[PDB]
RNA sequence: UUAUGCUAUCAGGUGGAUGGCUCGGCUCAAGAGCUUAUGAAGGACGUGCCAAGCUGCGAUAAGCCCGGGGUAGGUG
RNA sequence: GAGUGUGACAGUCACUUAGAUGUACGCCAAAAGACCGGAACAUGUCCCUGAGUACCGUGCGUUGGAUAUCGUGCGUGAAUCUGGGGGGCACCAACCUCCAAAACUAAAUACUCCUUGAGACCGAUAGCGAAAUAGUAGGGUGACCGAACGCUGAAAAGUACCCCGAGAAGGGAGGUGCAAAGUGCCUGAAACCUGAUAGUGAUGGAACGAUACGGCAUGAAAGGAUCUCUGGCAUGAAGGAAUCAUUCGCGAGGAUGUAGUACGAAUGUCACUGCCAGUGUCGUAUCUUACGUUUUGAAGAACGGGCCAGGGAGUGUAUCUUGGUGGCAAUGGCUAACCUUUUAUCUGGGCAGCCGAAGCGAAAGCAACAUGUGCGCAGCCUUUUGGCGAGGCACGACGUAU
RNA sequence: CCCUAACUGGAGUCCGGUGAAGCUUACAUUCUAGUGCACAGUCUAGAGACCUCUAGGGGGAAGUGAAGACCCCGUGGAGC
RNA sequence: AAGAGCAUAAGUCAGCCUGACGUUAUUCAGCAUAGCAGUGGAUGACGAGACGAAAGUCGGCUCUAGCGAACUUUUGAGCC
RNA sequence: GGAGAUCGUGAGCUGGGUUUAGACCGUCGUGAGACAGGUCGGUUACUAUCUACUAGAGGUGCCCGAGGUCUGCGGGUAAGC
């Protein structure tokens, strides 16, 4: 399918703005206790172990969503299991970083979690299943690098 | 808003258009102002026939401080010599720049609905 | 077509089941029959028999890009602010060569002093530019 | 105790549908790309303790020798 | 926290994974050495620079190649730097451009036996013909055509012993196992066949049913409990008597009154009751000559089906047109290939090009209204009759061809 | 042949064993007339008819077998 | 041909003539309603005329038949 | 005497005729071939499901149980011409 770059960027901007509305995010399925949007200081990008990410997410009131994705992982019904789609996975938290940093590997294995940079940000990360309202953690560098990102 | 109006509304996908149609019919009721019901019926019509009015028509047919409501988009072809307030669904970048530099206002249908609910003095442009 | 809506219709909107067989149900393949039984259809769709005129070689034939004096006049300030034109003692100096246009046409109004250099002008473009106080310059 | 039968359900037989499972298939992508007179590919026949097919092998015949990896089982 | 295996769903049980290590032969490979050697200018009655070739005539094929593609059959056939070829018919002239008739040459490209990976793919009548003792069994003299067949269980624990039996069959009894799942063994539908139960049945009429009411049987769950049965009372729409009195009519009867009354679909309410709904079969009553198709006309003595199960028919590319919904918008829209992929997504680039932006004309060519007037819908104002009036409509003017 | 008869062996008939195939939407004990695409076991109105089985020849089922080979049609073929 | 039209004529004779003209727009009717062609026929315009005092009439012969696409060639005028 | 019954009757028969492929004669046609002339030759499938009929049985109904003898609602006849 083709979508014009202008309207694709419009859709991306709409999905980014949807990460700030608590009603859309909680209606999307996420469990959280933070205040949106969640902007984290840049030192989140320099932490290299999953335990550090767990501590940050618990201090931010976001780890409940990760636990929901982990315990909500379920073996799906039908032929997809034989084809290689054994599980139906949930989406929990989107971490957006300013550039390629250790936080990509550090947060990578968290259940339901996506960690990407501003360059690699698209509509399907911000609206899984075409539903906007993804619970996302932005870093300072990501917010600084988003000034003319899709406009 | 019977089954025909409901078909037209359910057809639309832009939530701004749906909310505008609903609120315009509510305002036509409450204010007793057929201008808003008229705008709602124009917005319910097929989107392929929405107004795309250039600046040249506005300049040709308007006087100073003339309030225009365009049930569609304002485009930027032409020149605008006098200030004019324009309520439109959207604006081009050039249309916005021209209207701003000429001394006019580029407001939306919601803003004009809030500014004067009766619609007095408002002239519809297609 | 909507295959699902016709599940149960048997004929699937075709009328008789004896319809929808081959090119015989279209009167032939492609735009056949334009002299015999699709003659009126050929007239309607523009495929009527005949030849007309001649073509000159593309290597000698040429079309000229155009711009009317109204278009130049009423967006000349944008041209100067974008760099394609300059203001010399109040007169707009427009060179159509860097715009990609080779003929100025005379549709519209000229309200300012335009000093226009172009490969060609219509006569009416000449009078409209010269009455506005400007001049027309040919490209040698 | 009305037989020969008719209709419905049930039990069983026959049968192999349905469901579930799948070391198979198909398609796309990324690689890699010649071989044989130093006798190839392919075929025939043989070859196993009990071995008919297939597979492997060639009268040294489900195999022989050397080096490395593997290590306690092996004998398609 | 990819996944697979393991006695049911596993990041932590196993193999893995993420991430690191190692590796014989090979392959690429930088520093540093050895070697043939390269590039300008001046001078010119100087020398050389590809032949059955280039070209041309004619025939044919081929091509979009049109008197202007390429090939090649026949014929003919040059020139030599003061030269030769090309510039879409030939020739002349000018200008521009090249140097054939000898030779090689990486990369970017194509493909899929093969390797790896992946998948909105198929899931055993599907997907390859082949889940391969499958190009096999089998068929054809031959060229060649070509199947069917997957599954015990966690573990064989794959049924000891005993009885019957001619039995190395089979059956019974008895075991194993959570479960016979008992070896072509998971589940185990229907057709078909055997038996049982319910109803009916040897006086009976046929689209096998629908509807209503009954007999018999059933009515555990999943259906009702002011529900079912049987009555009372109140209100009751349309409709609406009987009987009697009077009168009219030749008569069958009519009219008026009784009487818009008693009643009346139903709607409430109060008692009573233990059934009712549903299901199977049979009976009585009314109705209907199957279904699909071809047909003006089908129950047809028109075509199709023995039955059941499964399979079985509007799809993709390109292009044109048009709707609904959107992005952007004359300072227009969109990019194509391609690059950026860190494994097909994606993000950011990419203006080549296409469409729109000026038409008319065969062509040469020439080239238009940013509104001159009127009517007037919506909307707004209004003294409710008018006014303004985007869009719309009708003119006027202008561009060009004739 | 008039005009058939008797007899012989093999089938058939009856018994034991073995053991297919072909027609089939359904129902079906019919008969007459009408009707209806004008050639009905099923429609309509009558008349008949207790069921099952065996043997028997073929009246009917416009019986079964075969997308009529006759005729026409098809901008269908082939040969000559 | 057939039907219709025509009498101070649309008939007959005579005088003068060549409108049996070049270009061009609509609308009819072939083809009701209601799309469809080459055409045909009515009303006009432009440019030139004939007759006639003028008005007029004349785009042949009173009206309705006597005819043919595209491609191709040839012919006419001037151009590309 | 005449006529009807799918010009009754080929799951009864026959096959002389017509109505295939072969061939001859005449005619027609340039010819292939044709003829509503003539001529010679030329394959007749099926195990009966239902219904109908012809005969022969077993049942059930009626019925004290059984047996015997009758009656005759009816059906048929050409039983003679
Ligand atoms: K598992
Ligand atoms: Mg793992
Ligand atoms: Mg298969
Ligand atoms: Mg297959
Ligand atoms: Mg099916
Ligand atoms: Mg035809
Ligand atoms: Mg017969």
Short mmCIF file of N, CA and C (backbone and C1' of nucleotides) in Angstrom, two decimals, chain H residues 27-64:
data_model
loop_
_atom_site.label_atom_id
_atom_site.label_comp_id
_atom_site.label_asym_id
_atom_site.label_seq_id
_atom_site.Cartn_x
_atom_site.Cartn_y
_atom_site.Cartn_z
P U H 27 -28.32 -41.38 -70.19
"O5'" U H 27 -28.91 -40.19 -69.33
"C5'" U H 27 -30.27 -39.81 -69.44
"C4'" U H 27 -30.71 -38.95 -68.29
"C3'" U H 27 -29.84 -37.75 -67.98
"O3'" U H 27 -30.07 -36.65 -68.85
"C1'" U H 27 -30.33 -38.87 -65.98
P C H 28 -28.88 -35.65 -69.23
"O5'" C H 28 -28.56 -34.91 -67.86
"C5'" C H 28 -29.53 -34.11 -67.23
"C4'" C H 28 -29.06 -33.58 -65.90
"C3'" C H 28 -27.67 -32.98 -65.87
"O3'" C H 28 -27.60 -31.69 -66.45
"C1'" C H 28 -27.98 -34.36 -63.98
P G H 29 -26.38 -31.31 -67.42
"O5'" G H 29 -25.18 -31.02 -66.42
"C5'" G H 29 -25.32 -30.07 -65.39
"C4'" G H 29 -24.28 -30.24 -64.33
"C3'" G H 29 -22.85 -30.40 -64.80
"O3'" G H 29 -22.25 -29.21 -65.28
"C1'" G H 29 -23.28 -31.95 -63.08
P U H 30 -21.54 -29.21 -66.72
"O5'" U H 30 -20.38 -30.29 -66.55
"C5'" U H 30 -19.51 -30.62 -67.62
"C4'" U H 30 -18.09 -30.74 -67.15
"C3'" U H 30 -17.85 -31.62 -65.93
"O3'" U H 30 -17.77 -32.99 -66.26
"C1'" U H 30 -16.62 -29.60 -65.73
P G H 31 -18.45 -34.09 -65.31
"O5'" G H 31 -17.67 -33.99 -63.93
"C5'" G H 31 -16.32 -34.41 -63.82
"C4'" G H 31 -15.68 -33.90 -62.55
"C3'" G H 31 -16.28 -34.43 -61.26
"O3'" G H 31 -15.69 -35.66 -60.89
"C1'" G H 31 -16.04 -32.07 -61.14
P A H 32 -16.55 -36.90 -60.34
"O5'" A H 32 -16.43 -36.79 -58.76
"C5'" A H 32 -15.16 -36.70 -58.12
"C4'" A H 32 -15.25 -35.85 -56.88
"C3'" A H 32 -16.33 -36.24 -55.88
"O3'" A H 32 -15.92 -37.27 -55.01
"C1'" A H 32 -16.38 -33.90 -56.26
P G H 33 -16.80 -38.60 -54.81
"O5'" G H 33 -18.31 -38.12 -54.95
"C5'" G H 33 -19.11 -37.83 -53.82
"C4'" G H 33 -20.10 -36.74 -54.13
"C3'" G H 33 -21.55 -37.16 -54.29
"O3'" G H 33 -22.22 -37.37 -53.06
"C1'" G H 33 -20.96 -35.75 -56.07
P A H 34 -23.49 -38.34 -52.97
"O5'" A H 34 -24.62 -37.59 -53.80
"C5'" A H 34 -25.14 -36.35 -53.36
"C4'" A H 34 -26.13 -35.80 -54.35
"C3'" A H 34 -27.37 -36.66 -54.58
"O3'" A H 34 -28.36 -36.43 -53.60
"C1'" A H 34 -26.47 -35.99 -56.65
P C H 35 -29.30 -37.63 -53.08
"O5'" C H 35 -30.33 -37.84 -54.27
"C5'" C H 35 -31.27 -36.83 -54.61
"C4'" C H 35 -32.08 -37.22 -55.82
"C3'" C H 35 -32.64 -38.63 -55.84
"O3'" C H 35 -33.79 -38.80 -55.04
"C1'" C H 35 -31.68 -38.14 -57.93
P A H 36 -33.84 -39.99 -53.96
"O5'" A H 36 -35.39 -40.15 -53.63
"C5'" A H 36 -36.15 -39.03 -53.19
"C4'" A H 36 -37.55 -39.05 -53.76
"C3'" A H 36 -37.63 -39.33 -55.25
"O3'" A H 36 -38.84 -40.03 -55.54
"C1'" A H 36 -38.48 -37.17 -54.81
P G H 37 -39.08 -40.74 -56.97
"O5'" G H 37 -37.62 -40.86 -57.62
"C5'" G H 37 -36.88 -42.08 -57.57
"C4'" G H 37 -36.98 -42.83 -58.88
"C3'" G H 37 -36.81 -44.33 -58.81
"O3'" G H 37 -37.93 -45.00 -58.25
"C1'" G H 37 -35.69 -43.49 -60.71
P G H 38 -37.69 -46.18 -57.18
"O5'" G H 38 -37.04 -47.34 -58.05
"C5'" G H 38 -37.72 -47.85 -59.19
"C4'" G H 38 -36.80 -48.60 -60.10
"C3'" G H 38 -35.96 -49.69 -59.48
"O3'" G H 38 -36.68 -50.87 -59.19
"C1'" G H 38 -34.60 -48.41 -60.89
P U H 39 -36.33 -51.74 -57.89
"O5'" U H 39 -34.93 -52.40 -58.22
"C5'" U H 39 -34.71 -53.07 -59.45
"C4'" U H 39 -33.26 -53.44 -59.62
"C3'" U H 39 -32.60 -54.11 -58.42
"O3'" U H 39 -32.94 -55.48 -58.29
"C1'" U H 39 -31.17 -52.44 -59.26
P C H 40 -33.30 -56.07 -56.85
"O5'" C H 40 -31.93 -56.66 -56.32
"C5'" C H 40 -31.26 -57.70 -57.01
"C4'" C H 40 -29.81 -57.75 -56.66
"C3'" C H 40 -29.46 -57.76 -55.18
"O3'" C H 40 -29.73 -58.99 -54.53
"C1'" C H 40 -28.04 -56.26 -56.27
P G H 41 -30.36 -58.99 -53.05
"O5'" G H 41 -29.14 -58.59 -52.12
"C5'" G H 41 -27.91 -59.30 -52.18
"C4'" G H 41 -26.86 -58.66 -51.32
"C3'" G H 41 -27.29 -58.23 -49.93
"O3'" G H 41 -27.41 -59.30 -49.02
"C1'" G H 41 -26.01 -56.52 -50.91
P G H 42 -28.57 -59.32 -47.92
"O5'" G H 42 -28.11 -58.25 -46.84
"C5'" G H 42 -26.99 -58.49 -46.00
"C4'" G H 42 -26.38 -57.22 -45.48
"C3'" G H 42 -27.18 -56.45 -44.45
"O3'" G H 42 -27.06 -56.97 -43.14
"C1'" G H 42 -26.41 -54.96 -46.11
P U H 43 -28.30 -56.91 -42.12
"O5'" U H 43 -27.83 -57.81 -40.89
"C5'" U H 43 -26.63 -57.52 -40.21
"C4'" U H 43 -26.68 -57.90 -38.75
"C3'" U H 43 -27.74 -57.18 -37.92
"O3'" U H 43 -28.05 -58.01 -36.80
"C1'" U H 43 -25.64 -56.63 -37.07
P U H 44 -29.35 -58.94 -36.77
"O5'" U H 44 -30.24 -58.31 -35.61
"C5'" U H 44 -29.68 -57.45 -34.62
"C4'" U H 44 -30.76 -56.73 -33.86
"C3'" U H 44 -31.84 -57.63 -33.28
"O3'" U H 44 -32.33 -57.07 -32.06
"C1'" U H 44 -32.81 -56.12 -34.80
P A H 45 -32.24 -57.87 -30.68
"O5'" A H 45 -31.15 -57.08 -29.84
"C5'" A H 45 -29.80 -57.51 -29.77
"C4'" A H 45 -29.10 -56.89 -28.59
"C3'" A H 45 -29.75 -57.15 -27.24
"O3'" A H 45 -29.36 -58.39 -26.68
"C1'" A H 45 -29.29 -54.84 -27.46
P C H 46 -30.40 -59.27 -25.84
"O5'" C H 46 -30.55 -58.48 -24.47
"C5'" C H 46 -29.46 -58.35 -23.57
"C4'" C H 46 -29.87 -57.60 -22.33
"C3'" C H 46 -31.11 -58.13 -21.63
"O3'" C H 46 -30.80 -59.19 -20.74
"C1'" C H 46 -31.27 -55.78 -21.90
P U H 47 -31.57 -60.60 -20.80
"O5'" U H 47 -32.24 -60.72 -19.37
"C5'" U H 47 -32.64 -61.98 -18.83
"C4'" U H 47 -32.64 -61.97 -17.33
"C3'" U H 47 -33.14 -60.67 -16.69
"O3'" U H 47 -33.76 -60.98 -15.44
"C1'" U H 47 -30.94 -61.07 -15.99
P A H 48 -35.32 -60.73 -15.23
"O5'" A H 48 -35.49 -59.16 -15.38
"C5'" A H 48 -35.09 -58.26 -14.35
"C4'" A H 48 -36.26 -57.46 -13.84
"C3'" A H 48 -37.35 -58.27 -13.16
"O3'" A H 48 -37.96 -57.51 -12.12
"C1'" A H 48 -38.25 -57.20 -15.06
P U H 49 -37.62 -57.78 -10.58
"O5'" U H 49 -36.98 -56.40 -10.09
"C5'" U H 49 -36.84 -56.09 -8.71
"C4'" U H 49 -37.23 -54.66 -8.42
"C3'" U H 49 -38.71 -54.34 -8.56
"O3'" U H 49 -39.43 -54.67 -7.39
"C1'" U H 49 -37.46 -52.74 -9.77
P C H 50 -40.89 -55.33 -7.46
"O5'" C H 50 -41.84 -54.10 -7.75
"C5'" C H 50 -41.79 -52.94 -6.93
"C4'" C H 50 -42.54 -51.80 -7.58
"C3'" C H 50 -43.94 -52.13 -8.06
"O3'" C H 50 -44.89 -52.08 -7.01
"C1'" C H 50 -42.77 -51.01 -9.77
P U H 51 -46.10 -53.14 -6.95
"O5'" U H 51 -47.07 -52.69 -8.12
"C5'" U H 51 -47.51 -51.35 -8.22
"C4'" U H 51 -48.09 -51.07 -9.58
"C3'" U H 51 -49.11 -52.06 -10.10
"O3'" U H 51 -50.39 -51.89 -9.55
"C1'" U H 51 -47.56 -51.57 -11.81
P A H 52 -51.35 -53.15 -9.30
"O5'" A H 52 -51.71 -53.66 -10.76
"C5'" A H 52 -52.53 -52.90 -11.62
"C4'" A H 52 -52.66 -53.53 -12.97
"C3'" A H 52 -53.08 -54.99 -13.01
"O3'" A H 52 -54.46 -55.19 -12.78
"C1'" A H 52 -51.28 -54.66 -14.49
P C H 53 -54.98 -56.41 -11.88
"O5'" C H 53 -54.98 -57.66 -12.86
"C5'" C H 53 -55.69 -57.64 -14.09
"C4'" C H 53 -55.08 -58.58 -15.09
"C3'" C H 53 -55.03 -60.05 -14.72
"O3'" C H 53 -56.27 -60.71 -14.93
"C1'" C H 53 -52.93 -59.39 -15.55
P U H 54 -56.79 -61.83 -13.91
"O5'" U H 54 -56.11 -63.17 -14.42
"C5'" U H 54 -56.15 -63.57 -15.78
"C4'" U H 54 -55.12 -64.64 -16.05
"C3'" U H 54 -55.13 -65.82 -15.09
"O3'" U H 54 -56.08 -66.80 -15.47
"C1'" U H 54 -52.91 -65.04 -15.38
P A H 55 -57.20 -67.33 -14.45
"O5'" A H 55 -56.54 -68.63 -13.80
"C5'" A H 55 -56.11 -68.65 -12.45
"C4'" A H 55 -54.87 -69.49 -12.29
"C3'" A H 55 -54.55 -69.91 -10.87
"O3'" A H 55 -55.32 -71.02 -10.43
"C1'" A H 55 -52.61 -69.03 -11.85
P G H 56 -55.76 -71.13 -8.89
"O5'" G H 56 -54.40 -71.45 -8.14
"C5'" G H 56 -53.65 -72.59 -8.50
"C4'" G H 56 -52.35 -72.64 -7.75
"C3'" G H 56 -52.46 -72.51 -6.24
"O3'" G H 56 -52.88 -73.71 -5.61
"C1'" G H 56 -50.75 -71.10 -7.01
P A H 57 -53.48 -73.66 -4.13
"O5'" A H 57 -52.21 -73.25 -3.27
"C5'" A H 57 -52.31 -72.80 -1.94
"C4'" A H 57 -50.95 -72.40 -1.44
"C3'" A H 57 -50.88 -71.75 -0.08
"O3'" A H 57 -50.82 -72.71 0.96
"C1'" A H 57 -49.71 -70.41 -1.62
P G H 58 -51.67 -72.51 2.30
"O5'" G H 58 -50.84 -71.42 3.11
"C5'" G H 58 -49.49 -71.65 3.47
"C4'" G H 58 -48.87 -70.44 4.10
"C3'" G H 58 -49.67 -69.79 5.22
"O3'" G H 58 -49.54 -70.44 6.46
"C1'" G H 58 -48.95 -68.13 3.72
P G H 59 -50.66 -70.25 7.58
"O5'" G H 59 -50.90 -68.67 7.58
"C5'" G H 59 -51.27 -67.95 8.74
"C4'" G H 59 -50.92 -66.50 8.57
"C3'" G H 59 -51.88 -65.49 9.18
"O3'" G H 59 -51.65 -65.29 10.56
"C1'" G H 59 -51.37 -64.86 6.96
P U H 60 -52.78 -65.60 11.65
"O5'" U H 60 -53.55 -64.21 11.80
"C5'" U H 60 -52.85 -63.02 12.13
"C4'" U H 60 -53.47 -61.82 11.47
"C3'" U H 60 -54.95 -61.60 11.70
"O3'" U H 60 -55.25 -61.03 12.96
"C1'" U H 60 -54.49 -61.34 9.41
P G H 61 -56.65 -61.37 13.67
"O5'" G H 61 -57.75 -60.70 12.73
"C5'" G H 61 -57.91 -59.29 12.70
"C4'" G H 61 -58.97 -58.86 11.73
"C3'" G H 61 -60.37 -59.40 11.96
"O3'" G H 61 -61.07 -58.70 12.98
"C1'" G H 61 -59.83 -59.60 9.67
P C H 62 -61.80 -59.47 14.18
"O5'" C H 62 -63.14 -60.03 13.53
"C5'" C H 62 -64.10 -59.15 12.95
"C4'" C H 62 -65.03 -59.90 12.04
"C3'" C H 62 -65.75 -61.09 12.65
"O3'" C H 62 -66.92 -60.71 13.36
"C1'" C H 62 -64.82 -61.71 10.57
P C H 63 -67.10 -61.12 14.90
"O5'" C H 63 -67.09 -62.71 14.90
"C5'" C H 63 -68.00 -63.45 14.09
"C4'" C H 63 -67.56 -64.89 13.95
"C3'" C H 63 -67.59 -65.70 15.25
"O3'" C H 63 -67.98 -67.05 14.99
"C1'" C H 63 -65.38 -65.66 14.39
P C H 64 -69.07 -67.78 15.93
"O5'" C H 64 -68.21 -68.41 17.11
"C5'" C H 64 -68.82 -68.80 18.34
"C4'" C H 64 -67.84 -68.70 19.49
"C3'" C H 64 -66.55 -69.48 19.32
"O3'" C H 64 -65.60 -68.77 18.54
"C1'" C H 64 -67.43 -69.85 21.49
#
